[PDB]
Amino acid sequence: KLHRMGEPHGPKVLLIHGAGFYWQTCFARIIRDLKDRYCLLIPELEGHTAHPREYMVSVEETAGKLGEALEELRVDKVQAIYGVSLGASVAVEMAIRGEIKVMNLLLDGGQYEGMGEMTEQYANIMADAFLNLLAGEHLPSPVKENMGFAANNDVEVLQPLIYEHITREALLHALLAAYRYDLKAKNARVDARVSVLIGGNEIYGAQFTPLLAEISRHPLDIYEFPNRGHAEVLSKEPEKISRLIREILN
C-alpha cells in the first residue's frame, strides 16, 4: 500500500511514517511543498489504516515488501528517504538491502539499539502512552522528558500525529518491530549519504550518530533544531523538512 503523489517522472522521494502515525496526516504539508517537482511515494506501515488486514512483523519484512512495491512502479532508485521514528529504521534497512538504490537518507528520531527481550515491556508502555495522547493525557516520566517534552507540550505536539483510528494491536506490533530492530548486528554498509535530524530537547538525540557514521561509506551531515523534541519539527514545522529535502537534493 504505496501512495503516489506529485510529479510521477520527477525525482523520487520516499516518506516513511512512524509507529502510530498515518501516511496522510504525517506528510500533508511536505507533499504540498514538493509535489510541483518531486515524485512522492508514501507507504502505509502495516495495520496503519482504517480496516487493517494485517500487522507489522519486522522492519526487515516491511522494508522487503516496500522494495517490491517500488519495483512494481519500476522505481529502482530514490533520491531521498525521509523516515520518522520507526520509519527511519525502515529507511536504513532499505539502504542496506540494496534491491533499490538510495542516494540520501534523512533520519529523524531513529532508534536502532535492539532491545531483545525488553522489547515487549517497552512496546507495551509506549503503546499505552501514545493512545493516552488521544485522551490529551501526558506521556509518563521519564519518557516525556527523554523525548524532549519537559515543557508539557507533548500532547500539543504529538497528538496531531497519532492516527485517530489506530488500534492498539496494530500500534503494538509496529512498536515491537521498532524496538526489536538491531542495526549494529547487521555489520552493514550503506552507499547513501546520511543526514540526521535531531531536536535539541531530545536528551539522547545523538546516541545513534556514531553507529550511523560507521555504517555510511560517507561522512554524516547533522541538522540540529533547537528547542525541539521528538518529531516536533514534523508536527509543527513540516515546511522546514521540505526545505531541507530540496536543499540536500541540490
Automatic annotation (TrEMBL):
Protein name as it appears in the record: AB hydrolase-1 domain-containing protein
AB hydrolase-1 domain residues: 13-240
Top-rank taxon: Bacteria
